[PDB]
Amino acid sequence: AEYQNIFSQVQVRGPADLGMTEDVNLANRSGVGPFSTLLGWFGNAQLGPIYLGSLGVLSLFSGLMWFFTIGIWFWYQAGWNPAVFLRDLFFFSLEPPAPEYGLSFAAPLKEGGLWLIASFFMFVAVWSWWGRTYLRAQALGMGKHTAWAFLSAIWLWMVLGFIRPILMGSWSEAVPYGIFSHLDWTNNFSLVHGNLFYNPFHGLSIAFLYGSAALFAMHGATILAVSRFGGERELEQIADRGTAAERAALFWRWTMGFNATMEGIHRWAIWMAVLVTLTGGIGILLSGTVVDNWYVWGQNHG
């Protein structure tokens, strides 16, 4: 029988959408890319255009220098052998300097100086990309929620690779660039601090992650169930409430006794998501700097 709106039945296309101008410098906008019919079954078919100013270029050259630096080490660990490289891909690892070196930049390339260089390029990449999330919003007249949310992610990333090591007194506390190595680090970090299940901020972090999945499932499901009334046109439902927004609200009111608004749900969503990395970064930053063992900490309720 009936149709569910997970995939489109019919695509339509017209001239490529170059976008709103507002205060964007159009010189820095590429041109449209291909249209992907595959993508179109699910979302939009139009690829591009993208905006590449100075920050963008910097961000992305730096991002590649990070990736190429890690990759150059991978080949070296492979003794330049293409077969070994693919075989051992998930085992290679770019490790930070040893404790010996503390926080200094003294360490030889093969003993973690290369990790410092990779880390330098990544730091430029991410912060400049951050600067980009803010500016591309500024140029369009939009609020800066995106930059503020991305900052929550950054916080966790900074805590792991930069702030915590600094406070701990050595780069060897940081995370190695490798697939398996980074999971071993993670496991070993929990063991070494008494199991992070006893870290109350870890427990929150989990609550919000799981919560993020429930909320997006609820929200997405909800919007699809009222998309036969135009529900996905969220910004106009905010400006002039229609029956989509009302049936949404009422589904939930009747189900769990309270509900949201078409705008407010997006606030629940931004905060549910950002509290994951927000609580997480704190839990981590406290670990070893202030608390050597969360079980023991927990035994004194604090």
Partner 1 sequence: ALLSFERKYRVPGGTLVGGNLFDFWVGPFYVGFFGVATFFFAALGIILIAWSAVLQGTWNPQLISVYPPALEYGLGGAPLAKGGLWQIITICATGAFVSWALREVEICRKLGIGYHIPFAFAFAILAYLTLVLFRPVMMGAWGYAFPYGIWTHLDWVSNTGYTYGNFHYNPAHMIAISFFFTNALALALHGALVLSAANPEKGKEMRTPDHEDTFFRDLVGYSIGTLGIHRLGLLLSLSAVFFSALCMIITGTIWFDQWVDWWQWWVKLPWWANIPGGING
Partner 2 sequence: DLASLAIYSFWIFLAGLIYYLQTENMREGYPLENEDGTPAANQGPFPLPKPKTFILPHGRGTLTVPGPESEDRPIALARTAVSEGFPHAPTGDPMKDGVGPASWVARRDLPELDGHGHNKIKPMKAAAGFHVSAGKNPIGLPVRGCDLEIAGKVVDIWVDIPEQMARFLEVELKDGSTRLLPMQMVKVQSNRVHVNALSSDLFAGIPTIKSPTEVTLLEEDKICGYVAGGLMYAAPKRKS
Ligand X SMILES: COC(C)(C)C/C=C/C(C)=C/C=C/C(C)=C/C=C/C(C)=C/C=C\C=C(C)\C=C\C=C(/C)CC/C=C(\C)CCC=C(C)C
Ligand Y SMILES: CCCCCCCCCCCCCCCCCC(=O)OC[C@H](COP(=O)([O-])OCC[N+](C)(C)C)OC(=O)CCCCCCCCCCCCCCCCC
Ligand Z SMILES: COC1=C(OC)C(=O)C(C/C=C(\C)CC/C=C(\C)CC/C=C(\C)CC/C=C(\C)CC/C=C(\C)CC/C=C(\C)CC/C=C(\C)CC/C=C(\C)CC/C=C(\C)CCC=C(C)C)=C(C)C1=O
Ligand U SMILES: CCCCCCCC/C=C/CCCCCCCCC(=O)O[C@H](COC(=O)CCCCCCC/C=C/CCCCCCCC)CO[C@@H]1O[C@H](CO)[C@H](O)[C@H](O[C@@H]2O[C@H](CO)[C@@H](O)[C@H](O)[C@H]2O)[C@H]1O
Letter for the amino acid at 208?
F
Q: Which residues bind ligand X (CB under 6 A)?
A: 67-68, 70-71, 74, 116, 119-120, 122-123, 157-158, 160-162, 175, 177-179, 182
Q: Is 150 in the site for ligand BPH (CB under 6 A)?
A: yes
**For 287, phi and psi rounded to 5 degrees?**
-80, 115
Residue in the shown chain whose Cβ atom is closest to ligand BCL: 280
SS3 51: strand
Binding flag, residue 254, ligand U (CB under 6 A): no
Rounded Cα–Cα distance for residues 284 and 102 (Å): 20
Is 176 in contact with 115 (CB distance < 8 Å)?
Answer: yes
Place of tokens 């429930």: 214
Q: Does 204 bind ligand LDA (CB under 6 A)?
A: yes
| φ, ψ at 35 (rounded to 5°) | -100, 130
| 3 state DSSP class of 35 | strand
Give me the phi and psi of 290, to 5 degrees please: -115, -35
266 appears as a binding residue in the annotation? yes
| CA pair distance 302, 290, nearest whole angstrom | 11
Output DSSP code: residue 67.
H
297 labeled part of a ligand binding site? no
**Shortest approach of ligand CDL to residue 92 CB, angstroms?**
32
Q: How many residues bind ligand Y (CB under 6 A)?
A: 9
Q: Token digits for 26? A: 């159009």
Residues in the chain: 302
Asked whether position 235 contacts ligand BPH by CB under 6 A, the answer is: no
The region of 41-49, 87-95, 184-192, 233-241 touching ligand Y under the rule CB under 6 A is 41-49
Residue nearest to ligand Y (CB): 31
49 is written with which tokens?
A: 């255009």
- Token readout for 298 is 């927990």
List contacts with ligand BCL (CB under 6 A): 126, 153-154, 156-157, 160, 186-187, 189-190, 195-197, 201-202, 205-206, 209, 276-277, 280, 283-284
Q: Which residues are annotated as a binding site for a ubiquinone?
A: 252
List contacts with ligand BPH (CB under 6 A): 59-60, 63-64, 67, 125-126, 129, 133, 146, 149-150, 152-153, 210, 213-214, 217-218, 221, 255-256, 273-274, 276-277
List contacts with ligand CDL (CB under 6 A): 143-145, 148-149, 151-152, 155, 270, 274
Q: Which residues are annotated as a binding site for (7R,8Z)-bacteriochlorophyll b?
A: 182, 202
